[model samples]
Target: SGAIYVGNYRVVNRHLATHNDWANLVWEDSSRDLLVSSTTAQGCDTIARCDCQTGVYYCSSRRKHYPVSFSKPSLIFVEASEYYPARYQSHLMLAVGHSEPGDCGGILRCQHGVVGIVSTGGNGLVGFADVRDLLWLDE
Candidate 1:
């Protein structure tokens, strides 16, 4: 059965000096056939997962939109792994450079009538223990 097409939304929107630019990268988990979308910031080394999947449209990254209040030299690595069950959900990981301090990262999970957010990073791979919560956004 084919997944029904729901809708579409913008994932990564970076404004550099008034111009809007974006990076689109899609990765597939061959084992589960789940698709994940990722974007990168070369200068800051910030990597983020901009989309996951819901029906057919990828609307994960649009979950939050706000001004970046904290600035630091960091990179964003967006990844997908089967944590919430058969569906592939997008998760974020960050790497901060030594030059910056007070840098942090977080996660927002929405699923199963639960929404969870976790603050992360001083360094190293962050591990998630919850299996019920998932980030339900299209990628």
Candidate 2:
């Protein structure tokens, strides 16, 4: 078998602001299709950009996007990880009913704008990075 892509994930974490932590891939053209998702996913070293409010995380393995309403991440909390905290809250916590694999690049959508990218999971919860920081890293 090839790389699970997200598995054996070589996630690249960057400490930006006081409480912001972003992750994603190396940013390349070949690194298209699969996102930082866990398949249906693997570890991703980068974040993804999507056009939300249009009912799409705008990415997936099949290039077939998933709707956002199904797992609307409406809460925020520090995940149980070393990345959290100011030093605090390095990671974001999301709750999704489906497999987080396809949620990698998704903003995980909320009432306002970007939330984060679906990164990890624990005890029926999803984990991601602060996309605001991820986007900041872009521009």
Candidate 3:
């Protein structure tokens, strides 16, 4: 059977900083939906998703490095808006840690992110300058 298995996962030892750790968001191919979770030094673990768009996973506590766990697996469909254009076609993977600016948790490492495509018009259809376009498509 070609069926996909969407399993529950827990985010362990993830750190958070304002606009830094921000939060680690990703879509699992098994369920094709987005899962958002976060951690803090204050020892708060929050994991959530919504039927509505623009769902936010709020942190009730302020912890630098805490564990966020998710169980009771369910199927989810990742919405188009979840794609981050900055990483589109860059061949760059997102990660979490605490160490630098725009760096998740301050540590730079390869982690899963919003997967997308970058288009360069070589057929002269959309001529002129080369473009790095981001689109969500099944490869």
Candidate 4:
């Protein structure tokens, strides 16, 4: 696709790297569980959508850290709780966040088919309508 801080090439796709600073939160993530369970989740204030299950919500504070990690960039996923059980939509999204080749379309396509996962080069941002649906038109 493009090039990197390394060199130029008409190779496959690009690669991401943990920021060389101490604040790099992903350094240890690659060695982490391929599937991050509900064991790792959190929320904020009344951080609500004002709507109910018809709610395809989005939060400025959500994203996937695994399922795929190029070090330089990434794709998608979601979150939920309460007596308000999660739907298959939410369930499916959660799995994609933890591991790539395990399910999803695989990084091969990801390396060629995906754009930005959320708002940056990696770190997934939460989007309800699968984010992809909200960001792009698709099946």
Best by lDDT: 2
Tens-digit lDDT track of model 4 for 1-139: 1111101111111122223322322112221111111112232212221212222211223322233322221222222322123232221222112322112222211322322222112233222111222121121
lDDT of each model, Cα atoms only?
0.23, 0.37, 0.20, 0.21
**Which stretches in model 2 have alpha-carbon errors above 4 Å?**
1-89, 133-139
Stretches off by above 4 angstroms in model 3 are 1-19, 22-40, 44-72, 82-139
Error of 4 at 118 (Å): 10
What lDDT score goes with residue 82 in model 4? 25
Cα lDDT tens digits for candidate 3, 1-139 = 0011112222211112123223443322212112223333322222222121111111112223322221122222222333332222222222121222121221111122211111111221110101111122111
On the 0 to 100 scale, the lDDT of residue 15 in model 4 is 21
Error of 2 at 107 (Å): 2.5
- Give the least accurate 10-residue stretch of model 3, judged by summed lDDT: 125-134
Give lDDT: candidate 4, residue 122.
21
TM-score of each: 0.16, 0.32, 0.16, 0.18
RMSD of 3: 17.8
lDDT of 1 by residue, 34-129 (tens): 233342331221122323221111112333322111222123333432232332323322222121111111222322211112212235322111
Model 4: pairs clashing at backbone N, Cα or C within 3 Å = 16-70, 16-71, 16-72, 17-71, 17-72, 63-124, 67-98, 67-99, 67-100, 73-121
Against the true structure, candidate 3 reaches a TM-score of: 0.16
